[PDB]
Amino acid sequence: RAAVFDLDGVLALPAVFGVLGRTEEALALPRGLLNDAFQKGGPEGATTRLMKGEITLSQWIPLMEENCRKCSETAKVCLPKNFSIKEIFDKAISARKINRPMLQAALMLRKKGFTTAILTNTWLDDRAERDGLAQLMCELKMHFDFLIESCQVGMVKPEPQIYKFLLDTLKASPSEVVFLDDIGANLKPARDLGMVTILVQDTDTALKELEKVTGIQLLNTPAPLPTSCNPSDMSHGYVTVKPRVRLHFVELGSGPAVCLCHGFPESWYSWRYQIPALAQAGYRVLAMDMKGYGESSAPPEIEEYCMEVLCKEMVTFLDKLGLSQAVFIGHDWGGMLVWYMALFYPERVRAVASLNTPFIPANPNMSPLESIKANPVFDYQLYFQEPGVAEAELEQNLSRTFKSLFRASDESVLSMHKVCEAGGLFVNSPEEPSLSRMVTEEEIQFYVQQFKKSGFRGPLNWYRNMERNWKWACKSLGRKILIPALMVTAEKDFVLVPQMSQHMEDWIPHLKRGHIEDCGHWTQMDKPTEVNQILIKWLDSDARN
Amino acid sequence: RAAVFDLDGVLALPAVFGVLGRTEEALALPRGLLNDAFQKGGPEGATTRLMKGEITLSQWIPLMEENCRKCSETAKVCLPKNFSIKEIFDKAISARKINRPMLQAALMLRKKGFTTAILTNTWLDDRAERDGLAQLMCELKMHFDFLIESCQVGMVKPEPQIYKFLLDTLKASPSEVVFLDDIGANLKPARDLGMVTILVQDTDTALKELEKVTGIQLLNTPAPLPTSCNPSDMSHGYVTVKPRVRLHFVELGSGPAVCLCHGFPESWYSWRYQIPALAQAGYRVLAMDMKGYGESSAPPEIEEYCMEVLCKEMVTFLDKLGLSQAVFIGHDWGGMLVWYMALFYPERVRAVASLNTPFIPANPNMSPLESIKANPVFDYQLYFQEPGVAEAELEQNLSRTFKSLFRASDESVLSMHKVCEAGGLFVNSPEEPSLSRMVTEEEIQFYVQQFKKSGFRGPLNWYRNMERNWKWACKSLGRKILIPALMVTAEKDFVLVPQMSQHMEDWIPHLKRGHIEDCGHWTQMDKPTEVNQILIKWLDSDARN
Ligand SMILES: O=C(NCCC(c1ccccc1)c1ccccc1)c1cccnc1
Ligand SMILES: O=C(NCCC(c1ccccc1)c1ccccc1)c1cccnc1
């Protein structure tokens, strides 16, 4: 089973074709005058050549004007002064945006096994403002198995040849595929070939028919999760920051550089729901494997993971990439790292944002051990101190380790208080952990394979530089954070609790805030939609400026 | 032997300190009033704390104002209405630019074995416009073994402690290092420690002393080559564009995306002299290993290298990277590829530029073999047709192969006419080729190691799709290139000759041009300086728009 969608009038509205109507009604020109000069000559006509890839759009612009002159001459009328055909088409193409509900339908269909494809009559766009069209196509493109464009295949969609091409591309019998189009003429051939068709007038009715014939709930369906990341479809970057320390990252999009720093014990993949969203919002996302994780190097020495060397290496990372600046968004331990980036390298940080992780200034008086002991929820951090112990139980069963950890506010299974002395992190934890509703088995197996490379030594070493970090932090006790800064709290995070951030204003006067209801500690995958809304909104106003 | 440079007044002019003089003379304020409130309190003073990293610049701004008030109060004067200390420092820092001649000196010194370092009194810049300072520092940073900043080490350069730190960092005896500073006070301690010092008033005199004491020609020295690329200091990107085809690239800088496409038989490294330059000019450079080369996949099948699949894969490359558009700059075969990107995917090409490679439209009448036979200089292309033959002699001795090829206009050694029948490409070529003046032995060994991975099959396959490329090109015979386009010709390129481009205007009406004197076929490394000037100038006006 497969599904095929037209672009104009189906996956994109308002249909550009419907500008040759508006324009007439607006200029009070004779009904059809435009849509006639547009199709003048039929197959031999300029527009058909334009659509077959014989000529470019800019080449076509003049041809359409001559027709409009010769079309209004026979109709015995005359177009105004600065009647601009380019002007009309510019705002028409620009006005046309994605049909979100129709895209959802395609998504679900594909999610449930359908081969999806876009088949459109279109042109080679060489306009000065062609990038707008290319941006839309890229966004749509990614969601379909195939994109067949008339100007690329040299065929045009009324012609029966392109339909045989479609099926050949799809590897499917006509009877096996649905075909949606806003133009009836372009429906016949598919119908005649024996495949299901749907004249698309209003979107919801078409989806009714679609849902109707597919036996799949498409309409009124729940709000979907943001687009995720298939690891092997990603651009992977590698930078050596030191004799034998190499950092790995995934990169997507263009615009201001946004560096995403995950926490413990995670990876770049923990940003899977925001990487596409932020790129889409006009940003260049660099999602890190922090030192010790995934494809980044993982040196055994503890001091390799104190905040001073971690931050210095991040600075070197920008250096090697030719970046004077980046916005740093961190979560958990990454959030900690991000606050220190802000305090120690303001020149390098376009803006700082933390998820869950508050900024707590060091206490010059109390040892970082007294202070951490002074919090019952941080009992497992004393457990992490002795090298090898925590590694052993965390590395013993990887799938179990993550299935236990990566859980929602409710479905917890870990006794996080009284951990070390009562045994370990998984004292009375099932050795057969249920699958969280936040994660599929596949996503868990990704973290499993990642951690098979270096294990937990490196990650745990982040916990073993308390006295070093404390000494370093004490240097910044006279400083304030005065660059754009955003703190986001998660209600149900029971160790990185919202209340811990209550005093941050003192140190970060212009601090902007965000908060998420019923969100646990794994913010990115727990509430991806709201997370994306909050960061994208904050970037637009504080990062791009 | 080592060399140490101050920033302000030494590697950067005009000295920011010298704004507390200008400002006074401009506002007709009492001599010194500013430079006094600036240093008020000495060690305990705000500025010293600012320079030690105790406070940020923005924290310091208010402290300096109070002093100026209290400093003008004792002097019995009063500052004007909107006397803005921030305003003064903003334009001061912004006005300060690199001292090019002083940087050259550092470069040469380092090139000849010196350990170089910058030692400066500086601050943590949290200004809204801090990025300007960060950009300068990044550019300078890269050229030195070490960058020691007062606000980072908690020490300040008058203090003797920072000097011991400097030497410890340098691993050198005082007697072994030179130390240049514009402030005499900051010279004493180095002198007292026994190291050579140079009060820097005018740059040329300081360089006279420098050259004088180093025994190295630093002044009046020839124009240096552009900064190059150390492969292992680069950000390396990897994108899978197909089931088993992966593309490798090097990435540097931010701004509009610039995709550099090398020719035959080369690599990303062939852009080594422009990658840093273009990044510096405000662009995000993606230097490709084209399909078949270096760390990119090299499938054995010939059709894997026809222009249609090569271009489609480049399009996929943008897709995976989240790029709607890129400017495509090609040389040789890359230039060919770039013209087809423009003809077949205008939406994707911000702008097109070719080095040496003209745009010649296909001849619908003559076979691509007749046409290529019709040119004596293209005799070696018939030699490339039969699979295995050319691979064999090209792979037989890699160092020889490149040493023979990569040669300047003059120092040629290859009989390029009557090649196949008279034996091979290296018929009467020395098996012990001299080293070209364009290349060091090291750079040759880089290409050698790269080509040890896949050999020449893939590269040569670019030559084996003539009939396929011809058929594909014939589709575009009705089209014109109307996006920003630039053609650059090289006088002494005796196969890709300037005259071949003479008709391009017909197909590319708004075509901009460039030309290089006494430049051979290996344009990038032959005339890197002029190449950079031409592309950077064309990008600024046609790419950024
Ligand atoms: O320990 C930190 N984060 C780990 C938080 C995470 C967890 C993972 C494994 C074992 C124990 C805890 C967790 C899992 C479930 C619910 C809440 C938190 C930390 C420390 C300092 C600064 N920033 C972060
Ligand atoms: O053959 C092409 N370039 C190779 C040019 C290069 C060369 C390398 C090896 C063997 C033979 C020639 C060369 C070396 C020295 C001087 C001039 C050219 C070509 C073909 C079509 C389109 N664009 C480029």
Q: How far is B506 from chain A (nearest CA, A)?
A: 14
Which residue in the block uniquely carries the two structure tokens 């040569």? Answer: B460
Q: What tokens were used for A47?
A: 């527009």
Residue B228: Cβ within 10 Å count: 15
How remote is the CA of residue A405 from the centroid of ligand 1, in Å?
A: 9
What gap in Å lies between CA B122 and CA A463, rounded to an integer?
32
Amino acid, single-letter form, for residue B170: L
The residue count for chain A: 545
Ligand 1 touching residue A331 (CB < 6 A): no
Q: Name residues 100-139 of chain B within 8 A of A (Cβ).
A: 124-126, 130-131, 133-135, 137-138
Whether B521 is catalytic: yes
In eight-state DSSP terms, residue B411 is: S
Q: Enumerate the domain spans of chain A.
A: 1-14+95-215, 15-94, 234-545
Q: What tokens were used for B351?
A: 């702008």
A360 to A176, A312, A483: CA distances (angstroms) = 61, 21, 17
How far out from the chain centre does Cα A324 lie?
Answer: 24
Q: How many CA atoms lie within 13 A of A8 on its CB side?
A: 19
What gap in Å lies between CA B473 and CA B482, rounded to an integer?
17
- A39 touches A45 (CB < 8 A): yes
Q: What tokens were used for B226?
A: 């552009």
Are A237 and B237 an interchain contact pair (Cβ–Cβ within 8 Å)? yes
SS3 readout for B181-194: ECCCCCCHHHHHCC
Domain A15-94 fold is DNA polymerase; domain 1 (1.10.150)
What would the DSSP string read from start to end of A387-398?
TTHHHHHHHH-H
Q: How far apart are the first and last CA of chain B?
A: 48
DSSP H helices in A143-254: 150-153, 160-170, 188-192, 203-214
- B489 touches B356 (CB < 8 A): yes
Q: Which helix (H) or strand (E) holds B42?
A: none
Which chain B residues are within 8 Å of A325, Cβ to Cβ?
A: 131, 134
Dihedrals phi, psi of A479, to nearest 5 degrees: -95, 160
What would the DSSP string read from start to end of A421-433?
TTSSTTTT--SSP
Q: How many CA atoms lie within 13 A of A228 on its CB side?
A: 16
Ligand 2 touching residue B337 (CB < 6 A): no
Q: How far is B9 from chain A (nearest CA, A)?
A: 21
What gap in Å lies between CA A545 and CA A350, rounded to an integer?
10
Q: How many CA atoms lie within 13 A of B441 on its CB side?
A: 2
What gap in Å lies between CA B247 and CA B240, rounded to an integer?
6
| Paired strand residues for A329 | A260, A353
Q: How many CA atoms lie within 13 A of A60 on its CB side?
A: 25
Q: What tokens were used for B489?
A: 């010709």
Instruction: For B136, name the nearest residue in chain A, comparing CA atoms only.
Output: A324
Angle, alpha carbons A239-B140-B441 (nearest 5°) = 65
Q: How far is A323 from chain B (nearest CA, A)?
A: 6
What gap in Å lies between CA A408 and CA B356, rounded to an integer?
60
How far out from the chain centre does Cα A261 lie?
Answer: 15
- Find, among A253, A289, A257, A254, the residue nearest to A271 by Cα: A289
Nearest to A475 among B125, B154, B238 (CB): B154
The residue count for chain B: 545
Reported in sequence order, the residue ranges of A10-81 that DSSP labels E, i.e. its strands, are 12-13
Ligand 1 touching residue A357 (CB < 6 A): yes
Best of B261, B262, B264, B310 for a ligand 2 pocket test (most atoms within 8 Å of beta carbon): B264
DSSP H helices in B28-178: 33-37, 46-52, 57-74, 85-95, 100-111, 131-141, 150-153, 160-170
Which chain B residues are within 8 Å of A124, Cβ to Cβ?
A: 344-347, 479
Which residues in B83-100 are b (16+ Cβ under 10 Å) and which e?
bebbebbeebbeebeebe
Whether the CB of B536 is below 8 Å from some CB of chain A: the reply is: no
Class of domain B234-545: alpha beta
Q: Name residues 465-504 of chain B within 8 A of A (Cβ).
A: 475-476, 478-483
Determined by which method? X-ray
What gap in Å lies between CA B377 and CA B93, rounded to an integer?
56
What gap in Å lies between CA B283 and CA B276, rounded to an integer?
10
Q: What tokens were used for B459?
A: 């590269």
Q: How far apart are the first and last CA of chain A?
A: 48
Q: Which helix (H) or strand (E) holds B350?
A: strand B349-355
- B542 touches B512 (CB < 8 A): yes
Label the pairing between strands B115-120 and B2-5.
parallel
In eight-state DSSP terms, residue B539 is: I
What gap in Å lies between CA B479 and CA B483, rounded to an integer?
12
In eight-state DSSP terms, residue A463 is: G
What would the DSSP string read from start to end of A222-277?
PPPPPP---GGGSEEEEEEEETTEEEEEEEE--SSEEEEE--TT--GGGGTTTHHH
Ligand 2 touching residue B495 (CB < 6 A): yes
3-state SS class at B240: strand
CATH topology agreement for domains B1-14+95-215 and B15-94: no
Which chain A residues are within 8 Å of B142, Cβ to Cβ?
A: 319
- A493 touches A517 (CB < 8 A): no
Q: Which helix (H) or strand (E) holds B351?
A: strand B349-355
Q: Could you give the angle at which helices A19-27 and A85-95 cross, rounded to 10 degrees? A: 130
What gap in Å lies between CA A82 and CA B147, rounded to an integer?
61
Q: Does domain A1-14+95-215 have CATH number 3.40.50.1000?
A: yes
Which residue in the block uniquely carries the two structure tokens 């993550």? Answer: A402
Nearest to B59 among A252, A350, A479 (CB): A479
Whether the CB of A348 is below 8 Å from some CB of chain B: the reply is: yes
Angle, alpha carbons B115-B116-B122 (nearest 5°) = 145
Dihedrals phi, psi of B105, to nearest 5 degrees: -55, -50
How remote is the CA of residue A500 from the centroid of ligand 1, in Å?
A: 14
Are A350 and B131 an interchain contact pair (Cβ–Cβ within 8 Å)? yes
Which residue in the block uniquely carries the two structure tokens 């930078």? Answer: A239
What gap in Å lies between CA A259 and CA A335, rounded to an integer?
11
- B231 touches B252 (CB < 8 A): no
What gap in Å lies between CA A153 and CA B472, rounded to an integer?
11
Ligand 2 touching residue B38 (CB < 6 A): no
Which residue in the block uniquely carries the two structure tokens 């140079």? Answer: B198
Are B240 and A251 an interchain contact pair (Cβ–Cβ within 8 Å)? no
Residue A8, annotated ligand binder? yes
From the alpha carbon of B378, which atom of ligand 2 is closest?
1
Q: What tokens were used for A375?
A: 């919090």
Amino acid, single-letter form, for residue B71: C
| Paired strand residues for A513 | A487
Angle, alpha carbons A540-B348-A102 (nearest 5°) = 65
- A99 touches A13 (CB < 8 A): yes
Residue A121, annotated ligand binder? yes
Whether the CB of B347 is below 8 Å from some CB of chain A: the reply is: yes
In eight-state DSSP terms, residue A437 is: S
What would the DSSP string read from start to end of A37-49?
HTTTTGGGSHHHH
Q: How far is B89 from chain A (nearest CA, A)?
A: 16
What gap in Å lies between CA A409 and CA A497, rounded to an integer?
12
Q: Spell out the residues 6+ positions from residue B345 whose beta carbon is closer than 8 angstroms to its own.
A: A124, B311, B315
Catalytic residue among A181, A331, A521, A542: A521
Whether the CB of B212 is below 8 Å from some CB of chain A: the reply is: no
Q: Name residues 390-419 of chain B within 8 A of A (Cβ).
A: none
Which chain B residues are within 8 Å of A231, Cβ to Cβ?
A: none
Name the residue at shortest CA distance from atom 13 of ligand 2: B521
How far out from the chain centre does Cα B446 lie?
Answer: 18
* For the CA of A404, the nearest ligand: 1
Q: Spell out the residues 6+ positions from residue A529 whose beta carbon is closer than 8 angstroms to its own.
A: A223, A225, A226
Amino acid, single-letter form, for residue B278: L
Nearest to B319 among A124, A125, A141 (CB): A141
